[PDB]
């Protein structure tokens, strides 16, 4: 199927698109814009419906998916100052679309590495990575062990950049189980964290195979919290990565915790200083049955970035991460400007 724009309108995005075997359209979304607004036309991803034609500043739009389809990304986007829509581009998902291991690893890293190149400004040890693994009986030992191996190579992949972040390892079921705490003197020791990632097993949560994700995120909360104003709090990037099927049945809505976390990090609580770049949440669907609606509600929504992933075969991610380790590629440093206290010109 091909797209064409009326007169006076410019076409950006794939003009021709082909229906592929993965139940997805090839190329990028077609958008017919006139470039007459503060922000450009967000466009209408195939399968969705946009409600909002005004693209002024402070204006907004809303997206809805057809019946039987699940919306991935943001359902509402607001035109922010500086010409840039909030959240991320929506996408109508079905019940068999999945994601190829490469696609996942490719997008997960193109979003992670960037939020690390900036971390170099400059133990230690100025980024935290909370690994929350789901050990519920609804995942099975197969899709669980494959999730660890994937994490292992991820830690090595990160390490290949020569960066030493603080790690926090937690597996959860009916109750949360903390293996590594960022406050530990060994959290920044990649090898340390890896040895733990190996000692854990799927049989660890067999006696009480609940799925209380809420308490799991509460475990992470207590790790980033304070006993009541550490000197280095408004300079630390927090990254939460959790594997789950999104099928929680104990504790209620886990999202409430995410909000509490954002309140703790003073995020989205200042018009002039959003501080969104200080918290990223990645959610990987692992179990046989995965609720794309719930894992999308936890994952972050950042423009041009993907935080929700539904691994097809899994285990292949592990082999992809290992293949994507390249010590030759350097870590960028261009166009970097951080709000330092003194802020003398030439710092800006």
């Amino acid at each position: 199927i091909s797209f064409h724009c009326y007169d006076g309108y410019t076409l950006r995005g794939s003009a021709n698109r082909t229906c592929q075997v993965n139940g997805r359209w090839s190329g990028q979304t077609a958008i017919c814009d006139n470039g007459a607004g503060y922000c450009s036309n967000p466009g209408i991803p195939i399968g969705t419906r946009k409600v909002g034609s005004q693209y002024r500043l402070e204006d907004s739009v809303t997206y809805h998916c057809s019946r039987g389809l699940t919306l991935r990304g943001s359902q509402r986007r607001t035109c922010q100052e500086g010409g840039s829509w909030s959240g991320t581009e929506p996408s109508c998902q079905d019940s068999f679309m999945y994601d190829t291991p490469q696609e996942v690893a490719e997008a997960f890293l193109s979003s992670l590495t960037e939020t690390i190149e900036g971390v170099d400004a400059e133990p230690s040890g100025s980024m935290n990575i909370y690994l929350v693994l789901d050990g519920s009986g609804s995942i099975g030992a197969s899709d669980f062990t494959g999730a660890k191996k994937c994490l292992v190579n991820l830690i090595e992949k990160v390490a290949s950049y020569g960066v030493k972040p603080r790690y926090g390892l937690v597996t959860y079921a009916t109750y949360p189980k903390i293996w590594v705490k960022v406050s530990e003197a060994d959290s920044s020791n990649a090898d340390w964290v890896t040895k733990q990632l190996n000692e854990i097993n799927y049989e660890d949560h067999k006696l009480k195979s609940g799925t209380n994700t809420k308490k799991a995120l509460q475990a992470v909360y207590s790790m980033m919290s304070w006993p009541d104003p550490p000197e280095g709090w408004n300079r630390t990037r927090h990254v939460i990565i959790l594997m789950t099927d999104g099928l929680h049945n104990m504790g209620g809505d886990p999202i409430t915790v995410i909000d509490e976390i954002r309140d703790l990090l003073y995020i989205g609580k200042d018009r002039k200083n959003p501080r969104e770049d200080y918290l990223d949440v990645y959610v990987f669907g692992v179990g046989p049955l995965v609720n794309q609606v719930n894992i999308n509600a936890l994952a972050s929504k950042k423009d041009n970035e993907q935080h929700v992933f539904k691994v097809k075969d899994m285990e292949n991610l592990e082999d992809v991460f290992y293949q994507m380790i390249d010590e030759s590629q350097s870590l960028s440093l261009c166009g970097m400007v951080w709000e330092h206290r003194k802020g003398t010109d030439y710092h800006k």
Binding site: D7, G8, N34, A36, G37, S53, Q54
Partner: protein, 214 residues
């Protein structure tokens, strides 16, 4: 300069698609610089640009986005060559909240005028058919009135309710009610004045209602 707009009336929130044709004093394509303004109903410019039909073959595709919170009324698209600010071309388009009807209504009198001493009166035909050709089944409310100057005088006595069978109707204005509409004994004083018809068809389903006028 000739300005073309896709529609004749737009709803708040839609976009106006218009084109400017740049021809010389011989009606031929030419590359020129054109100024374009957009005046609100009260005649105040809200947007102005400076385009050029250069390398465009005397055709300037354009568009204007109508705000959700816009002013209802007759908007205006004014334009002119940069080397002739005095000679200004313009085209109007109406902005209003509405919904497209399902059928049209036509009111054609037997004659394109009216003879004063015509005892028969003014016979008017009421043709109403759906947009897809089919004929309308419903009722019609037709009324008359007199217009002399920029001022109209309704004739409450000339109210009729004729049925619309097979997409057709028939109503007549008795000469009695006409002369009785005014009060002036003379009938030659009506000479020069004009009459107007106001029809209203309504389907038996009561789902749609169209208003016409001649």
């Amino acid at each position: 300069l000739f300005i073309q707009t896709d529609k004749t009336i737009y709803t708040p929130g839609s976009t106006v698609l218009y084109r400017i044709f740049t021809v010389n004093h011989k009606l031929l394509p030419v590359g020129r610089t054109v100024m374009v303004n957009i005046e609100n109903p009260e005649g105040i410019p809200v947007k102005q640009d400076s385009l050029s039909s250069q390398n465009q073959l005397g055709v300037l595709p354009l568009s204007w986005d109508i705000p959700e919170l816009v002013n209802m009324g007759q908007w205006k698209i004014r334009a002119y060559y940069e080397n002739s600010p005095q000679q200004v071309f313009s085209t109007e388009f109406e902005v209003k909240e509405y919904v497209l009807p399902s059928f049209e209504v036509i009111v054609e009198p037997t004659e394109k005028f009216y003879y004063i001493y015509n005892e028969k009166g003014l016979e008017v035909t009421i043709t109403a058919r759906f947009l897809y050709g089919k004929k309308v089944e419903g009722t019609a409310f037709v009324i008359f009135g007199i217009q002399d100057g920029e001022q109209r005088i309704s004739l409450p006595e000339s109210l009729k309710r004729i049925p619309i069978e097979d997409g057709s109707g028939e109503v007549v204005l008795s000469r009695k009610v006409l002369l009785d509409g005014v009060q002036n004994p003379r009938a030659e004083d009506l000479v020069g004045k004009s009459l107007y018809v106001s029809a209203t068809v309504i389907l038996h389903s009561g789902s749609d209602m169209v208003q016409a006028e001649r």
